Amino acid sequence: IVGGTNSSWGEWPWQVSLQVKLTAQRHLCGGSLIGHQWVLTAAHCFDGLPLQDVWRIYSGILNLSDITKDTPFSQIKEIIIHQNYKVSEGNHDIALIKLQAPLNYTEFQKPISLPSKGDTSTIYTNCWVTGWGFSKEKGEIQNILQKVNIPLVTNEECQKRYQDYKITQRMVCAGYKEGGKDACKGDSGGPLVCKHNGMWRLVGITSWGEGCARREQPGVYTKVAEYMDWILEKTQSS
């Protein structure tokens, strides 16, 4: 998160950190707790990493350097990447993670309410992106959860800023004309939540951007309302 500020405990209790343990253990992406045993993230977090056994999920945390061998973590029982997701491409960048054991809810660890498919026509107005990714383009992973207030942009306006790419109806864009505020590398998979009628709702999943925080370059997110039939069929089928 480029241009954000430190978050507090209990502020974003659905935020989780997906970490890989290879020679070292490193935060790669965010995620959003959506039920006792389901986390929602971006499918590209898994590109090139063919086993779930390397992943550790951390929830109810604020500071990544607090994580030691004592910190409790969740393990992956299964990853459902959307069928039509194609590696290195940006469509259907969404995956569900079923955890091996259900998580108990605390003020520091609680799910985010999902929108309905019908909320796809809703224009939200107070949106926030959070995570531990870079604070600047070509930057580093942050220790304290960052949070930033970003305005959504219409898909037509976002399409004019990314003429080289096809920003579809299953994507949502957010950013300033001047740039400065955006998600970045390491924020991938995390929440874009908007407070609508006094309730936080998961509107996007952080997906990609031309660099980070650049002028007239809004970040692109998977639009969760367009995937609500897929989320309900895959978590219910399981």
Q: CA 74, CA 72: separation in Å to the nearest integer? A: 7
Q: How far apart are CA 216 and CA 229, in angstroms?
A: 32
What is 180-201 written as a DSSP string? Answer: --B--TT-TT-EEEEEETTEEE
**CA of 107: how far to CAs of 103, 112, 184, 232, in Å?**
13, 12, 27, 25
Q: Report how far apart, in Å, the C-alpha atoms of 35 and of each of 7, 104, 114, 132, 213 are.
A: 22, 10, 10, 22, 31
**CB distance 216 to 172 below 8 Å:** no
Technique behind the model: X-ray
Structure tokens at 149: 């207030």
Whether 93 sits among the annotated catalytic residues: the reply is: yes
Contact 60, 52 (CB under 8 A): no
- Distance, in Å, from the CA atom of 176 to the CA atom of 152, rounded to the nearest integer, reads 9
Catalogue all structural domains in the chain, each as residue range(s) with its CATH number: 1-12+112-226 (2.40.10.10), 13-111+227-238 (2.40.10.10)
The single-letter code of the amino acid at 74 is S
1 vs 183: CA distance, rounded Å: 4
Other beta carbons within 10 angstroms of residue 41's beta carbon come to 29
∠ Cα 154 226 7 (to 5°): 70
Classify strands 55-59 and 38-41 as parallel, antiparallel or unpaired.
unpaired
Q: Which DSSP category does 77 fall into?
A: E
Residue of 93, 135, 182, 196 marked active site: 93
Contact 32, 39 (CB under 8 A): yes
Q: How far apart are CA 65 and CA 53, in angstroms?
A: 22
| Catalytic one of 44, 82, 92, 196 | 44
Resolution for the entry shown, Å = 1.9
The residue whose two tokens read 């929602």 is 40
Q: Can 44 be counted among the known catalytic residues? A: yes
Sheet holding 127-131, edge to edge: 5-6, 146-150, 127-131, 191-196, 199-208, 219-223, 171-174, 152-153
Q: Of 145, 60, 41, 58, nearest to 109 (Cα)?
A: 60
CB 181 within 8 A of CB 2: yes
Catalytic one of 32, 135, 188, 207 = 188
C-alpha–C-alpha distance, residues 48 and 54, integer Å: 12
Instruction: Provide the 10 A C-beta neighbour count for residue 14.
Output: 23
Q: Which amino acid is at 114?
A: L
66 is catalytic: no
- Give strand pairing partners of 192: 129, 204
Contact predicate 18/26, CB 8 Å = no
